[PDB]
Design a binder for this molecule. Structure first.
Ligand SMILES: [Cl-]
Length: 178
């Protein structure tokens, strides 16, 4: 009968790279809610979240990839998954989200984009909301030791790892104060 639409369901059915392990772990602590996948890539994370109760908005560049996600979305009947084409280097957005995630996307953005993009994620997060960031540390951009954490001064620093994953990645789960 039941085949639950978890990370293994999506890899078996569509053959995309597996849902990020930090998105899987975050989902155990972040209650389903209004979620922005900011730089959704192939939609691996957006598909998982939308199939598991989150109301997802998935944005990235690449018209082909976004159309591919939209086609899988339609096959999976995920009416709670909205997709749009964006350029993260020029995007300014509005909105109020329970959860914003950015996983392995910033390293491909211009270094000058990052401060404004993080400011934008922060102001569009509801009080008590969560931001998840997974990002390379030290081609066009990489965070320096402690930098991701400094951007999030004043938020509850729930989880923050700077560990190998051949590149070091900073993984952060922060919650906005209420
Ligand atoms: Cl990154």
């Amino acid at each position: 009968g039941m085949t639950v639409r978890d990370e293994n369901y999506f890899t078996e059915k569509y053959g995309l790279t597996r849902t990020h392990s930090d998105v899987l772990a975050a989902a155990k602590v972040v209650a389903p809610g209004r979620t922005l996948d900011l730089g959704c890539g192939n939609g691996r994370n957006s598909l998982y979240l939308a199939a598991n109760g989150y109301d997802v908005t998935a944005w990235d560049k690449n018209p082909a990839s976004m159309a591919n996600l939209e086609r899988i979305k339609a096959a999976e009947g995920l009416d709670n998954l909205q997709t749009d084409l964006v350029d993260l280097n020029t995007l300014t957005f509005d909105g109020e989200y329970d959860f914003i995630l950015s996983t392995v996307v910033m390293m491909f953005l211009e270094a000058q984009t990052i401060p404004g993009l993080i400011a934008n994620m922060q102001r569009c997060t509801k009080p008590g909301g969560y931001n998840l960031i997974v990002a390379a540390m030290d081609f066009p951009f990489a965070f320096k030791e402690g930098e991701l954490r400094r951007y999030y001064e004043g938020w509850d620093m729930l989880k923050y790892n700077e560990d190998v994953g051949k590149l070091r990645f900073a993984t952060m789960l922060a919650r906005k104060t209420a």
